[PDB]
Write a protein that binds this DNA or RNA. Structure first.
Ligand SMILES: [Cl-]
Ligand SMILES: [Cl-]
Ligand SMILES: [Cl-]
Ligand SMILES: [Mg+2]
Ligand SMILES: [Mg+2]
Ligand SMILES: [Rb+]
Ligand SMILES: [Rb+]
Ligand SMILES: [Rb+]
Length: 136
RNA sequence: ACAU
DNA sequence: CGATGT
């Protein structure tokens, strides 16, 4: 219904899917970039969407912040809720890095607590999420 | 179909 | 147009 402006927004950017994956988190109110992950040579859109949310959880917990996180990814929100990223991406030598990060993100979720609400950004009503990369 |  | 997902 209403944007919660006091929040963190996250998004993935990619060159190909599967392809080069990066992600970032921004203050929804101001657009200030709060974190950015160095590009990962091969991953999927949904792995990056998932990593971005988990990184946001870790970022907010470290700072004792109760702000919610917005993501536009139905898939990644569900994977975080389940603590399991059900990616189809083949596990091989070239995908080792993204899968290591996904595995470590799941491991963190399984060993830590948080109350952070993870909210769906309503792109159809509100336009692109504020963490968007201008690239489609 | 919906979300990317 | 293609791929990733529920
Ligand atoms: Cl990560
Ligand atoms: Cl909330
Ligand atoms: Cl959702
Ligand atoms: Mg997105
Ligand atoms: Mg985007
Ligand atoms: Rb803390
Ligand atoms: Rb984009
Ligand atoms: Rb599809």
């Amino acid at each position: 219904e209403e944007i919660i402006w006091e929040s963190l927004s996250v998004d993935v950017g990619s060159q190909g899917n599967p392809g080069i994956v990066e992600y970032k988190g921004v203050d929804t109110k101001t657009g200030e970039v709060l974190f950015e992950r160095e590009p990962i040579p091969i991953g999927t859109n949904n792995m990056g969407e998932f990593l971005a949310i988990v990184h946001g959880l870790r970022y907010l917990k470290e700072r004792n912040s109760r702000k919610p996180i917005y993501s536009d990814s139905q898939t990644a929100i569900k994977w975080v809720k389940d603590k399991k990223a059900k990616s189809t991406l083949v596990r091989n030598e070239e995908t080792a890095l993204i899968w290591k990060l996904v595995d470590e993100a799941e491991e963190w979720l399984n060993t830590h607590t948080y109350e952070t609400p993870i909210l769906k950004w309503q792109t159809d009503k509100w336009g692109e999420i504020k963490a968007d990369y201008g690239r489609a």
